C-alpha cells in the first residue's frame, strides 16, 4: 500500500538535505524508497518554462500543476502501488505557499486545480523546515514563510514543523521519531 511523505520549506531551509537523509535512513533500514522532487519530477522541462521573465502567477501555478499532474500519475502513484515509501522534496504545499500566500492567488482555485492534478493524493506526513525569511524580495519570502506556517496550523496532524536553524542531525532525529510508529 506504500507511504507518501513530503518535505517543504523555503530554498536554503535544509528541506533537500533532510529529504535525502530520510531516504538514506529508510533505505539503510532495508525498506524500498523512491526519492523524487518538484519541480521536474513529472515534466523535467517545466524548469525551463518556469524561468520565463515576468510570468503571471496564474501561468506559474499552472506550470507547476502540469508537472505535478504528470508526477503523481507516472512516478508517485506507481511507486506507492509497489509498496514503496515515496518521498517528495516539495509537493502541492509549495504552490500554495509560494503562488497562493506569496503571489496572492486565491487558495480555493489552487485547490480545485489541484483536485484533478493530484487525484486527491495527500502526504501522510509533511515535514516543514521553518526558515526565517531573511536567511532565504524579502516581503515575498515573509509571506511565503508565514503561509507555510498557516498551512501547518490548518492541518496540524499532517504537518510537522521543525526549526530549520537546528543542526542537521537534530532535525533528522526529530523526523525519524515522527516516522518510527508509521513503521
User: Residues at the annotated binding site for ATP?
Assistant: 9-16
- Residue (of 160, 164, 144) closest to 152 by Cα position: 160
Among positions 69, 92, 121, 162, the unique one binding a copy of itself when judged by CB under 8 A: 69
**How far apart are alpha carbons 92 and 119 in whole angstroms?**
12
Residue 76 CA: distances (Å) to CA of 18, 20, 56, 82, 128: 19, 17, 28, 10, 20
* 15 contact, one of Na ion, a copy of itself, Cl ion, none, CB 5-8 Å limit per kind: Cl ion
Which of the residues 13 through 42 are near Cl ion (CB under 5 A)?
A: 13, 15-16
Q: What is the largest CA-CA distance in the chain?
A: 46
Q: Is 167 helix (H, G, I), strand (E, B) or coil?
A: coil
* 154 contact, one of Na ion, a copy of itself, Cl ion, none, CB 5-8 Å limit per kind: Na ion
Only segment of 25-33, 63-71, 126-134, 152-160 that touches a copy of itself (CB under 8 A): 63-71
Residue 113 near a copy of itself by CB under 8 A: yes
Of 11 and 58, which has the nearer Cβ to a copy of itself? 58
- CB contact at 8 A, 48 and 89: no
Residue 105 near a copy of itself by CB under 8 A: yes
Amino acid at each position: 500500500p506504500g507511504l507518501f511523505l513530503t518535505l517543504e520549506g523555503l530554498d536554503g531551509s535544509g528541506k533537500t538535505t533532510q529529504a535525502r537523509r530520510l531516504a538514506a535512513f529508510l533505505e539503510a533500514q532495508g525498506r524500498p524508497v523512491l526519492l523524487t522532487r518538484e519541480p521536474g519530477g513529472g515534466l523535467p522541462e517545466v524548469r525551463s518554462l518556469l524561468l520565463t521573465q515576468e510570468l503571471s502567477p496564474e501561468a506559474e501555478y499552472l506550470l507547476f500543476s502540469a508537472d505535478r499532474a504528470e508526477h503523481v500519475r507516472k512516478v508517485i502513484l506507481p511507486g506507492l502501488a509497489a509498496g514503496k515509501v515515496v518521498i517528495s522534496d516539495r509537493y502541492l504545499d509549495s504552490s500554495l505557499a509560494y503562488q497562493g500566500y506569496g503571489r496572492g492567488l486565491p487558495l480555493p482555485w489552487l485547490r480545485e486545480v489541484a483536485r484533478e492534478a493530484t487525484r486527491g493524493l495527500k502526504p501522510r506526513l509533511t515535514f516543514l523546515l521553518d526558515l526565517p525569511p531573511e536567511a532565504a524580495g524579502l516581503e515575498f519570502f515573509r509571506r511565503t514563510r508565514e503561509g507555510y506556517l498557516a498551512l501547518a496550523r490548518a492541518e496540524p496532524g499532517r504537518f510537522v514543523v521543525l526549526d530549520a536553524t537546528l543542526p542537521e542531525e537534530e532535525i533528522a532525529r526529530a523526523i525519524q521519531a515522527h516516522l518510527r510508529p508509521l513503521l
